[PDB]
Write a protein that binds this ligand. Structure first.
Ligand SMILES: O=P(O)(O)OCCNS(=O)(=O)c1ccc(OC(F)(F)F)cc1
Ligand SMILES: O=P(O)(O)OCCNS(=O)(=O)c1ccc(OC(F)(F)F)cc1
Ligand SMILES: *Cc1c(COP(=O)(O)O)cnc(C)c1O
Ligand SMILES: *Cc1c(COP(=O)(O)O)cnc(C)c1O
Ligand SMILES: [N+]
Ligand SMILES: [N+]
Lengths: 267, 394, 394, 267
């Protein structure tokens, strides 16, 4: 399929950026997570980034560490995640769905089989957080064989060799990291270097989405103004889950209000 | 792009977030430079000699082998400052941190020995040291936590995941991913992303170098086999490295069999786990059928790393080294035997290597064999563990 | 009639029941013979090298002395097998027991370190070992009692008198008075009846011999002073002996001042007790006004011998050595300082010698002085003592 | 004075051996100890050996170790012992009184002053348990200056040099040890070597008293038959004290019965 290409073309036609929330699949349970995801979409999410719970999420700060722990407390497994993914895609045919994976869950029972299951459930991209471009060959090849975009990370200090690699190897979108460190709303990143954004365009890279530390509407508008195609926000969304565990109704209300504001900032 | 090969056959690599690639590349470059620098080499040699106490003895154990055709020597890493081999390579890594202009050290630890080794090296060399330790380990290892604190280290409990060693490993990498510009990550074993398995080996290889010289001096020939316990792989690779090209010398690595391999309660991923990718490397590991990482169990709290260095997996794959396991009860018997017959209290980790040597001897007592066990540490830390068992069983 | 002089000036002698005179005469003869026997010397040298880990390092402590004109080296007896200097002379005494055809060892111990050293030497050398320990000490020293038992020693609690070290000393002599024909008494310090002060010195003198060679190698000259703590006197005499004829080298012995000399709660009989006769010798001791023997108090449980070796009393009387005291609080500060600035955890006994060196430096920081502290043991055993104080005071 | 010389001459005239009990002064208290000592004398003790409580009695087995501890529990000091000794001598003018001392109590505040205090209270001999003949010079000289007999020990293995020394240096009586080891009734010694007894007579030694492990009448008669002038018994007497602490009346009765039997065996 071509879901990110179709999305970006549509957004460009409306002179609009993408707003892309992250959540952990199955946090705080399968049924509530299905509702959370439907609420994000109804409130204006352009695409989704969806984490499969993993025992050792070494690119994540405490907020998302705790999301993984909640999902494991509910007994969430990768198989149940794939069931969830198939249902989400059946309800929503065009929204791009990206997975945030750690390498062992992809490699576990065969890299090829993993990307084939992604294709079967209608996933559009996979970002394997602990596979740098230098180790990416069997991941990106398997991704492309199965019509899945492999997502690569462009650090804020990326040299020319790395920009050329990310531009050539990635598809779907280029992940533009806002700073070093791990996920978390408590640590704000930089404006996108306009240099990186422009070098990526120069090398015909997939459109850039800025992520890490994006927690406010001003940051979304700033990303888009700097030339990024959009912005991803994870911890800020997951914090609303965490804060409202006792109240599913209020959780969905606050999710809707936050997503609406963030999406409004992309216009 | 790297200067050195990050793989040992199919095993190893650099499976870290993109943001950490430059820290690994910087470390590798500094290592390669240090290894050609005679001043670095001399400074490391001087610390090893005059601060840590190298060379360590090679002790012939005559009482244990009486009446058999086994001659058994113990390489006495138990006599190194800190009481274990870990001291060797933390001194080299601290010197590399200084070479790179880093002022801070991050370390992970499980049972605490690596934490103490990192704290003492940092105290000596003027580095500010922070150590991550799973909250369950912090609770269980008061003596080592207090040694780290007396040495001026900051000990930071890790409450995420299973609150043990693997979770401390993660947290160390999370910190480094944001702090690499000023901090060096002093990884505790011959595992993790390249260049650590290579660096840790080269900064432990004096164990086997001295062993070779010492056994040539006493016996006029190489050993038939050198035997070492395997947690993550550092003391074993340190003993093996200088013998790898001496093809007549057996290399035997001993993983913890815990309550028995068949119980599932063990720490022997090289022979009984499944290859995965975690902690920066492709290696055999302890993992669920779904690919979640699990804990290694052993009576010895230092054999808790849930995977194994990639060079060990490679040496096994090509048949250059053989790996075996020893259970809690075998290790406890070897512990008791060394205390009683040689007056040396071995670490329960090292007692795994000794148990396997004792088995080699006892199974075939008229086989002529010259064996060296790496006695990776002293067992003062284990005397109450052994007590709480040995009297609660007689 | 003896072969060697039993006195050091007015101090020393052989104040034992008549029944034990032949055991002392036999021991002296065997010692004199062993000292001329190159095979004995070679066997002792081999055990010291390949089993105990000699020579021990001499470590320059640069962080501690920064900004002063003091250069401070530590002689690393903490790195000897067993974790203290006591190992040296138990190996020599075990070899003398074997030379005499004895199959059994009797030893006394207070804090337990000598007990452990005797048990490990007996395990190595095939001797049956029994150790007397005052019942109050047995209660307070579970770790060492259990090490002795793991090594196959019989630990026998002494409930008479004050149930501490002096009472264990008595019991050892009571046993020996009936069992000398088959058992050797392995006395734990440079004290007791002749020939023990002489034997213990000669089997510790490699400490100062190596120190002299090591400091000549590094500095090209002798030290200005060598500093050692004094319980009964063995590690101090071992450091001093090879320097006694180098009259430019200061010899400084440091007794425990406990809560302060003026409190009476101390263990400094050389400078603050009264000459008496007890435990086979004429020496300064801790005693009541009536002549009953009293305990030595220190925070360090190993500085509990209630008298002092007679050679120390003699070296003091002639002004060749100077003796000083350091309080619990001074020793605790020196302990904390070495941990934090050098990454070495010193025994609280040894921390007395280090405290006095730190005082020499701090009082006169622009005095040019080259000092050696004998670091008689490691302080892993002390970390909870130091803990239970240091947090209960911040 | 000449109390041992007068005693042995009298006993020789009656073809009789000496029976000499040992007790610790002040065990179990000063007043009871005074009574115990009077009872021993009334029951036929020829002489007394009297221990001054000492913190570290390294020639004594458990029985006498415990006697010292009881005396210390009652606050007994060497000064009180000397007061007791003066009273005992005032009641009983001819009985020989020997002290069992450890060296530090003699050396403590001057060896000469110690033997002078012995002379003032009417003590006849002093045995310093941890001073061998090789160290004895200032003790024996001070003893003789003050008319006190220094007692020396002849071990069962004594060679010729030692026999000649004990014979020349001692006075009063020669202590013939029955065996190696420490005091105690639980360990019986040998018959006196008739060789030692005869060599001592050959060298005009002070008459021999056998001690250590003497606990029965048969041993007393055996000592005398072998040529000893008598026998000393300590632990066996002290055990009667220990057994009867709760009953002073029974204690004195059993003491009297035991001493009478032991003395009868000397005839
Ligand atoms: O808003 P935040 O700060 O929580 O960040 C949201 C991130 N969620 S995610 O799936 O895009 C994401 C993307 C990349 C990650 O790691 C890597 F860069 F190493 F690959 C981790 C998570
Ligand atoms: O009957 P026992 O077995 O209790 O022995 C009685 C001994 N009491 S004593 O005063 O004569 C006595 C005599 C000598 C002693 O020691 C020495 F030989 F080393 F000097 C100790 C006690
Ligand atoms: C930590 C430890 C080990 C295991 O680690 P390796 O890296 O496999 O050497 C072995 N022995 C001792 C004494 C230890 O402290
Ligand atoms: C026992 C001990 C001492 C004191 O004994 P000395 O005979 O005076 O040496 C000193 N240091 C250590 C470490 C000890 O264990
Ligand atoms: N393991
Ligand atoms: N003392």
């Amino acid at each position: 399929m071509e879901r990110y290409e179709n999305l970006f073309a549509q957004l460009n036609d409306r002179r609009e950026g993408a707003f892309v929330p992250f959540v952990t699949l199955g946090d705080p349970g399968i049924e509530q997570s299905l509702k959370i995801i439907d609420t994000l979409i109804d409130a204006g999410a352009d695409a989704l980034e969806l984490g499969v719970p993993f025992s050792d999420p070494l690119a994540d700060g405490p907020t998302i560490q705790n999301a993984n722990l909640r999902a494991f407390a509910a007994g969430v497994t990768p198989a149940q995640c794939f069931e969830m993914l198939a249902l989400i895609r059946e309800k929503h045919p065009t929204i791009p769905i990206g997975l945030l994976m750690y390498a062992n869950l992809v490699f576990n029972n065969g890299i090829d089989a993993f990307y084939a299951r992604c294709e079967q459930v209608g996933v559009d991209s996979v970002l394997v957080a602990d596979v740098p471009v230098e180790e990416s060959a069997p991941f990106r090849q398997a991704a492309l064989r199965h019509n899945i975009a492999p997502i690569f990370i462009c650090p804020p200090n990326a040299d020319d060799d790395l920009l050329r690699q990310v531009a050539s190897y990635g598809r779907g979108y280029t992940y533009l990291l806002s700073r070093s460190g791990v996920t978390g709303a408590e640590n704000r990143g930089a404006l996108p270097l306009h240099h990186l954004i422009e070098k990526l365009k120069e090398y015909h890279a997939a459109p850039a989405l800025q992520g890490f530390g994006i927690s406010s509407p001003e940051q979304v508008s700033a990303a888009v103004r700097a030339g990024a195609a959009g912005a991803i926000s994870g911890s800020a969304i997951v914090k609303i889950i965490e804060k409202n565990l006792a109240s599913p109704k209020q959780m969905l209300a606050e999710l809707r209000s936050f997503v609406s504001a963030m999406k409004a900032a992309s216009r | 792009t790297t200067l050195l090969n990050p793989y040992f056959g199919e095993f190893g690599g650099m499976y870290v977030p993109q943001i950490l690639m430059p820290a690994l590349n910087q470390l590798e470059e500094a290592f390669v430079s240090a290894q050609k620098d005679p001043e670095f080499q001399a400074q490391f040699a001087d610390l090893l000699k005059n601060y840590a106490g190298r060379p360590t003895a090679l002790t012939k154990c005559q009482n244990i082998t009486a009446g058999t055709r086994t001659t058994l020597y113990l390489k006495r890493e138990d006599l190194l400052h800190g009481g274990a081999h870990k001291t060797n390579q933390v001194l080299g890594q601290a010197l590399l941190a200084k070479r790179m202009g880093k002022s801070e050290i991050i370390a992970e630890t499980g049972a605490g020995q690596h934490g103490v080794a990192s704290a003492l090296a940092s105290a000596l060399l003027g580095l500010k040291c922070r150590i991550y330790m799973g909250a369950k380990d912090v609770e269980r290892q008061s003596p080592n936590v207090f040694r780290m604190r007396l040495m001026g280290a900051e000990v930071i409990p890790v409450h995420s995941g299973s609150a043990t060693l693997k979770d401390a490993c993660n947290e160390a990498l999370r910190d480094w991913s944001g702090s690499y510009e000023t901090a060096h990550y002093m990884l505790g074993t011959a595992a993790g992303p390249h260049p650590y398995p290579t660096i840790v080996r080269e900064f432990q290889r004096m164990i086997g170098e001295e062993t070779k010289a010492q056994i040539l001096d006493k016996e006029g020939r190489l050993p038939d086999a050198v035997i070492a316990c395997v947690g993550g792989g550092s003391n074993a690779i340190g003993m093996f490295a200088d013998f790898i090209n001496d093809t007549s010398v057996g290399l035997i690595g001993v993983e913890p069999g815990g309550h028995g391999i068949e119980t599932g309660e063990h720490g022997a991923p090289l022979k009984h786990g499944r290859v995965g990718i975690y902690f920066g490397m492709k290696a055999p590991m302890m993992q669920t059928a779904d690919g979640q990482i699990e804990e290694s169990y052993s009576i010895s709290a230092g054999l808790d790393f849930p995977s194994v260095g990639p060079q060990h997996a490679y040496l096994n794959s090509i048949g250059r080294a053989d790996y075996v396991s020893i259970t809690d009860d075998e290790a406890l018997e070897a512990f008791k035997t060394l205390c009683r017959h040689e007056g040396i209290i071995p670490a329960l980790e090292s007692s795994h290597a000794l148990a396997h040597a004792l088995k080699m001897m006892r199974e075939q007592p008229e086989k002529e064999q010259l064996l060296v066990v790496n006695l990776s540490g002293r067992g003062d830390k284990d005397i109450f563990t052994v007590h709480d068992i040995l009297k609660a069983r007689g």
